Design a protein around this ligand. Structure first.
Ligand code: HEM
Length: 152
């Protein structure tokens, strides 16, 4: 469980993200796809993209980045009391999109990397550890729902 101090660090950097939701979503998805190409293959929408330049030029990709970060932001602002927000996410990602928990670990890594690149003054070690804990909590709670549903 995160402390109030930890949540403050998480939400302080997150408020910086929300000044450019779409730029962050691009950077995060591109990092994910480049670092872990098996993730790209889960997106029928995006698997035609073969280069970073093509990814950066895709408005559809940029749109989806906003969808992802918007959902994450709503979860983080619940500070742990996010069960209603995760239910539908866990359900779609387990049963429709077929996304393993490991891939949620991968996108967590991408998020943390992009936050450090874009917001280093608000993303020192204390904030990095707090964000790690927040995204761990996210994964933990999704993983429990996957397990309920027979997906992990
Ligand atoms: C921070 C983690 C993530 C969040 C907050 C998130 C959020 C969302 C949201 C809000 C949607 C649309 C509503 C829905 O279908 O549930 C969606 C769709 C989808 N997500 Fe995620 N997602 C996350 C991670 C991933 C990862 C790691 C993958 C793949 C490796 C993934 C694959 C998909 C796919 C395939 C769709 C459908 C895209 C489409 O329209 O064709 N998601 N996600």
């Amino acid at each position: 469980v995160l402390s109030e101090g930890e949540w403050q660090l998480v939400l302080h950097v997150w408020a910086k993200v929300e000044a450019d939701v779409a730029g962050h979503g691009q950077d995060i998805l591109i990092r994910l796809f480049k670092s872990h190409p098996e993730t790209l293959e889960k997106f029928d929408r995006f698997k035609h993209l073969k280069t970073e330049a093509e990814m950066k030029a895709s408005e559809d990709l940029k749109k989806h980045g906003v969808t992802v970060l918007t959902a994450l932001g709503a979860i983080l602002k619940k500070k742990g009391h996010h069960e209603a927000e995760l239910k539908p996410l866990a359900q779609s990602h387990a049963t429709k999109h077929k996304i393993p928990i490991k891939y949620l670990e991968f996108i967590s890594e991408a998020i943390i990397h992009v936050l450090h690149s874009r917001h280093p003054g608000d993303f020192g070690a204390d904030a990095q550890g707090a964000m790690n804990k927040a995204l761990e909590l996210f994964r933990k709670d999704i993983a429990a729902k996957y397990k309920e549903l027979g997906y992990q």
